[PDB]
């Protein structure tokens with residue numbers, strides 16, 4: 001019963017892999033997960049990087065010597081920390097690079113049968129990462145991913161921000177089931193690397209439900225991957241966003257209002273009367289399954305647009321101009 005073990009850099013239980021090393025899917029396997037874990041612990045601790053592809057992933061002896069050599073170096077770093085050298089700060093957030101590794105790792109150990117999940121169908125990782133940098137978030141914020149799937153986006157944002165809470169809501173059974181495991185695997189692996197995350201919850205639910213009406217209303221940052229949603233769903237979401245508070249934000253893959261919205265007597269009731277909508281800077285090189293470069297849209301709840309329209313109706317000069325155009 002042959003095995004490979006990697007020690008945690010902060011003394012959690014070791015990662016143990018059987019030999020021969022499992023394959024996770026067409027592009028991922030345990031051997032590369034091991035190599036990349038070592039790579040990433042080395043980025044996490046430069047003394048280790050100091051001490052550390054001429055390796056044969058199909059040879060037990062070659063892979064055992066890699067793991068033994070990492071494990072020795074870890075022991076020696078733990079000794080160094082007992083001395084005068086300061087240990088690695090705990091309670092930090094993972095870098096974007098490490099987080100990407102962690103999420104792949106969590107996925108590798110959580111979604112055993114990809115196929116079961118495919119029948120409900122991560123360049124998104126980079127897009128979300130850009131959004132985390134642009135959309136400033138604080139501990140006043142509540143975050144939701146509407147239609148969260150197996151939960152990856154919620155995990156990523158929770159690892160990276162100070163929002164008071166992060167939620168994902170998913171209706172379908174397969175993805176909700178896998179999210180429970182993703183959650184367990186995520187907490188285990190974040191502990192393994194010694195890294196912190198903000199609070200989060202993954203839930204089974206319908207975000208168009210009556211419970212979610214009030215919850216949407218109290219959320220300050222919503223992400224929603226709506227490009228492929230149909231008009232009735234989008235229409236129903238527009239109605240839930242109408243109760244959001246001023247400064248609330250929605251980031252989506254298809255805008256919920258025209259980018260050039262001109263308020264007038266016929267469109268007074270439209271969601272565009274209460275939000276600024278902008279097309280966000282796209283990430284060079286990122287392209288959708290449609291071939292085009294990706295785009296995403298930021299909506300900010302701003303009721304001063306509506307206020308100014310009403311004020312303008314009181315001004316006979318402005319009222320005439322408006323009336324003459326339309």
Ligand SMILES: CC(C)(C)c1ccc(NC(=O)NCCCNC[C@H]2O[C@@H](n3cc(Br)c4c(N)ncnc43)[C@H](O)[C@@H]2O)cc1
Nearest residue numbers: 127147148149153170171172206207223224225251252253
């Ligand atoms: C814009 C940026 C780039 C920032 C951005 C990038 C990514 C994200 N977020 C994600 O990709 N999340 C995971 C994949 C999308 N989820 C599809 C899931 O929706 C579920 N769903 C549908 C209804 Br309709 C639905 C519902 N009514 N109630 C609950 N779940 C629902 C459906 O069962 C699928 O499992 C958000 C923003």
